Point group: C3
Chain length 236, copies 3
C-alpha cells in the first residue's frame, strides 16, 4: 500500500511512500485516487499531499516507458495528467508538502497545488530534455501556469534544475521551510486555508485557471496521439 | 469633498481623503472622474494618485453591496472598473502613491498605474475569497496583467496578503519607500515620466496592454450579468 | 569585418565587434547570418554570441532610420527581426554573452537566447519611448516572452532601464557574472547545454515558444505596414 490517508479535524493528509521514489505508476495512481475519494467523502476543508523522506516523487515509472508496450504507457501518462487535473480543479485548497526532490511527473504533480512548501535542498526539475524526451503539452500547460516567463523557458528546453530560493523566485514553490517542518507547516497552512470561504475559493480557483484547464483537458485527450506523432516523426 | 486636485508644474496630484477608508462609492467615483477631467483640461505631462494617511483605499463600499438593492451595486462596480479602465489607458504616465493598505477595488485601482510606490507595511490584497466573494472577471484581468503567474494564483483563490518585498516580487508594486517619502517619491517619478515622449508613451502603453483592455471592457459590460449568474447559481 | 566566427570543440563562438557600438545595420546583419551559416555547416552542439568590450549592441543604426529613405530602413528592421527569429528557433542551445549594454534591437536580440549572461553594470533597455518611438510588435512579442508581467509594462511604456539583479528578476538575463568572466562563463554554459539531447531540446524549445514565434513571424511580415500606419497616423 504506497499511500496513506489520514483525517485530522478540518483537513486530511495524503502521504506517498512506496518503497523508493514514489513513482507514479498505475498502482500509485489508483491509491492516490482512492485517497482523494476518501477526502471527497469526508468533505474535508483542505487537502495536504506529501511524499516520503527521500522524495516528493521521481515521476513516472521509467521502465513502463522503456518496455515498448505502448498502451499501458499511454494509460499511465493519461492517468498521471488526469490526476494532476483533478487536483488543479479540486474544490478545496490543496497544499503540497514537498519532502524531497520532485522530477518530471513529480514536479508537474507539485505544480497542481494551491500552495507548495519545500526545503532549500530539494531539486524541482523537468528533466525530460536531459534524458532525451520532449515534454508533453499537458505538462507544459501546468508549468506555464506557475513559472515566470523566463524560468519557464529554462525549465523546459534546458531542463533547468531549481532549488530553494531559485525555485520560489521561479514559481515552482510558494514557500521554503526546514526539512523537518515541511509537512508540519503544510498542515498548518492547510488549516488556515480551510478557514477561507469554500465556494468562493472553488469558484475563484477555476476562474484563475480557466484557459489552462481547458488546454490541459486537451493535453490529456491528445496524449496518445502526441506519442504517435513522435513515433512517426522519428521514423522519418 | 473626498478628493483634491492640485497642479504642480508639469504634473497634477489627485488625493483621496474621505473621512475614513477612501471607499470607492458613487460619490468618490464622481469626484475622481472630475479630478481626472481637470487633468485632461490642464493637459498635464503626468498624473499622481494618492490615498490618505491610513489607506490607499479599502475598496468598494461594503454596505451598498450588502443592502440587497442591486441596480446601485452594479452601477458602483461598473463605475469602479470604468475608472480603472480610464487610468489603465490614460495617455499620460500615471503614478500611484500607495499611502496605506489597498484592498479589493483599492488594489485593482492601484494595479492600473504605470508605476506604483508603497511602503513595506502596507497590505495589498484581493480579500474577496476571505469574505465570501468570487472575484469578478474585470479585476482578474487587471491582476493577470501585473502579477507573476504564481503570485496571481495565490492572490486570487487564496486571497493572499502582500507587503513590501513580497508585493514587489509579486508585481503588485514597482517600488518601495518609507511612508513619509511615498508621495514625494511618486511626484519625483511622475516628473521624470513627463520627460518621456507623450505620444510614443501613449501608443506603447496601449500596445503593451491591448488584450487586457479588450478583456476588461468585456468585464465591465458583463458585470451586471456576472452578478446574475451568481444569484441564480446560488439559488440552485 | 564586424564579426568573428570561431569553432571550439563542441561549440562555436560568434563575436560582434564593429568599431563602435555593434550597430545592427545591413552589413552587421549579413555577417552574423554568415557566421550562423558556418555553425549550421559545422553542426555545432551549442552557439555563443558575444559583443565587444563596450557593448552587446546599441541596436539598429540610428541614421538609417533618420535619413527619410524608407525601403532600406524597412529592410534593416525586417532583417533584424528575422535574425532574432532565426536564433529564437535555432535547433541548438544559444548562449548570449552580454559584454556591455544592450539597447533596443540589442536587447531584443539578447532576449532570443536560451541563456543570457551579463554583468551588474550593463544596461538593458528598450529606449524607444525615451527617444520618441513606439515599439514594434515583433519586439513586444520577444519581450513578452521573457519579461515578467510587471517588468514588461515598465520596459515598454516607460523605457525602464534594467541592470544586474533587477534585470535578472525582470527576466532580461538569466545569470550575472563579473565582466571578465561573462564570455568565459557563457562558453562553459554552452558546453554543458551541448550535453543535453539535441532533438528533445530542439523540439521542446519550439513548443515552449510556439505562439510567440507565430506572433513574431506576423510582426516581421507586418513591419513595413506597421511603419505605414505610423506615417499616416502622424499625418492626421
Amino acid at each position: 500500500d504506497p499511500v496513506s490517508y489520514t483525517r485530522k479535524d478540518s483537513i486530511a493528509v495524503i502521504s506517498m511512500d512506496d518503497g523508493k521514489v514514489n513513482a507514479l505508476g498505475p498502482a500509485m495512481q489508483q491509491a492516490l485516487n482512492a485517497a482523494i475519494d476518501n477526502a471527497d467523502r469526508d468533505d474535508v476543508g483542505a487537502l495536504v499531499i506529501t511524499g516520503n523522506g527521500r522524495v516528493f516523487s521521481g515521476g513516472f515509472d521509467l521502465k513502463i516507458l522503456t518496455s515498448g508496450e505502448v498502451q499501458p504507457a499511454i494509460d499511465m501518462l493519461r492517468g498521471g495528467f488526469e490526476l494532476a487535473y483533478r487536483l488543479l480543479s479540486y474544490p478545496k485548497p490543496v497544499v503540497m508538502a514537498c519532502t524531497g526532490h520532485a522530477i518530471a511527473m513529480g514536479a508537474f504533480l507539485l505544480s497542481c497545488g494551491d500552495h507548495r512548501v519545500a526545503a532549500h535542498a530539494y531539486n524541482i526539475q523537468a528533466n525530460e530534455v536531459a534524458i532525451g524526451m520532449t515534454i508533453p503539452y499537458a505538462a507544459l500547460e501546468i508549468m506555464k501556469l506557475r513559472l515566470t516567463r523566463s524560468a519557464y523557458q529554462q525549465a523546459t528546453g534546458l531542463a533547468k534544475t531549481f532549488f530553494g530560493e531559485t525555485a520560489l523566485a521561479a514559481g515552482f514553490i510558494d514557500e521554503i521551510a526546514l526539512p523537518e517542518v515541511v509537512v508540519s507547516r503544510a498542515e498548518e497552512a492547510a488549516r488556515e486555508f480551510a478557514g477561507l470561504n469554500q465556494h468562493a475559493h472553488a469558484a475563484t480557483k477555476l476562474r484563475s485557471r480557466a484557459d489552462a484547464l481547458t488546454a490541459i483537458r486537451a493535453g490529456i485527450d491528445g496524449i496518445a496521439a502526441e506519442f504517435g506523432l513522435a513515433e512517426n516523426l522519428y521514423f522519418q
